Amino acid sequence: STGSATTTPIDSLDDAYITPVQIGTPAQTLNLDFDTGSSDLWVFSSETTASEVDGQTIYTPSKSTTAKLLSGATWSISYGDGSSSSGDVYTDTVSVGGLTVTGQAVESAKKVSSSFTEDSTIDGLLGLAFSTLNTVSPTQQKTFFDNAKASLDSPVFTADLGYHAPGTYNFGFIDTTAYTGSITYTAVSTKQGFWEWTSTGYAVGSGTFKSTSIDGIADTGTTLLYLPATVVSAYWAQVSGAKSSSSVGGYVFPCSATLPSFTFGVGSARIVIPGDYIDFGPISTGSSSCFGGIQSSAGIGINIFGDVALKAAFVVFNGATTPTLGFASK
Template structure:
């Protein structure tokens, strides 16, 4: 199974105009380097700790317990009750996404709101081919109205998730524009069937930024959007500048001046991920994946238990499906090694979301037996993170 993500707390980008014109295969226009700001998802209804954990489990094939599903519903119910007392109509957000990505596809351009995910390698979208029962409320890509679309004969994709739900469809090539950059012949995977949990969310699909080797299109895997534009950039890399409760950005092709004293670690991309070796004083040595498509930090039972032993009153709550603690508790920092140095994730970022009864849900949770840790947005927000495909390395520059 190739994992895929619709991770929470993702970036969204400012939309740029697309000049109409004929699509030329394998042609890319690029300014060399550019920055794309993110903006909020207006449909975001609030952080849901159990949901963020369950979505990470589903992505990587870890079973989701009944109690965790029930905890998700409890948090959603509390959010809806709270919002019903104000002037905002509450809309359940099945994906718990705080940020989405406006991306333009086709000629003339059709704008869809997608996730950018370094933990997967497919660009797939809700479309006019999607079962109408699943596509309600989504912006749709309609290849029949795009003069630059071309169907890839015999190509299909089928992604199966850990709960055995799936998304599948056929494949087109078309113009795809993000920010000031256009790929004129990008594989766009058009969904025909979409599982219920994603149909209920606000996102219209995703843009995978992992390595093309795990793209799920058959019989011939397709290049990711980033792999198509990497050679035209000043440097074949991008930098995630995610921030806490304030807009951040992605920078493509250059490293911003604010990213100083960068610590680098070689990437093992044999499984298609941005995976590197690290260590911490609470968990020894281990491998980790830098994943913008996951919200939380997931790690071994031993590491997580060791961390929360430092937190008075913290406990593994079966009803919440994870570790909780008093919301007024000051959490310790979490530190991990990168190369010859160390990155610190402030304890304030690890206090993720209210869990009821004056308790909060932790941003570090057990990985469910995975052979690697997952460093999601909570870890990524502590640094400028460099995804360097040219040198096959990941860099972390501590934010002040």
């Protein structure tokens, strides 16, 4: 079997992408943030503290004839940005673009942090990292991808994120019409539960390519590109007036500047991120200082190839017994 669903930016900056997901019987459609950096499927629900819901569509297990409470199971998750949420667990039928999984763990939020409440467009997250990171206790649960794997034509899913435009998540097949040239595959380490890989280097604009190993994770759930301080300094040194701002919390640049592209290596292949992808607009309404889409990972502890990088490519998440990541230009 296969599945295919359109994913849409939530705002004019591509801060996140939402994908419609059908939960329960009859279907309740929620717009979920597909997150290859986490492994919990959790949703706003009829159980969420009422003052913490502000415009989200909620899942109501009592209205689903297939929903079963997972007795004694709880979940609690903290994301690298300081966001958090927690609740109890149901099992229900979950479908993504025609692909159906029965008995999927659906984690019902009882409490969510303020950053989730303020995001009216995101009804929850669908985690697509490895199931070892799932936070359900005392019995760990599998991700949607892991549950669907056996029935997929091929144990893969692909992320084709758009720049200021809709894109596609496919499950079970590779759309050979969606990319140019060849797909370059690279080894994945699952030892931390992430889609962790090693980039072979980088270049700034039309500059010389620097061969150097950059270990990082492919994370559709993170907006920006977080890279080591040396690399990020080399990039912003090429933008007149750019500086690192402690009050803003990262590199800013004059909004009148034109940004150079950024190239990262995948084996012997190269993915080019156009400079316009790195512009995230004024730091505050009306400001002439703009926020950069490439930032330092020094405070994070790990390099993150987030949406800024992934939307420049067609990305294959190959969940075979030896998992790999594929990157193609598009």
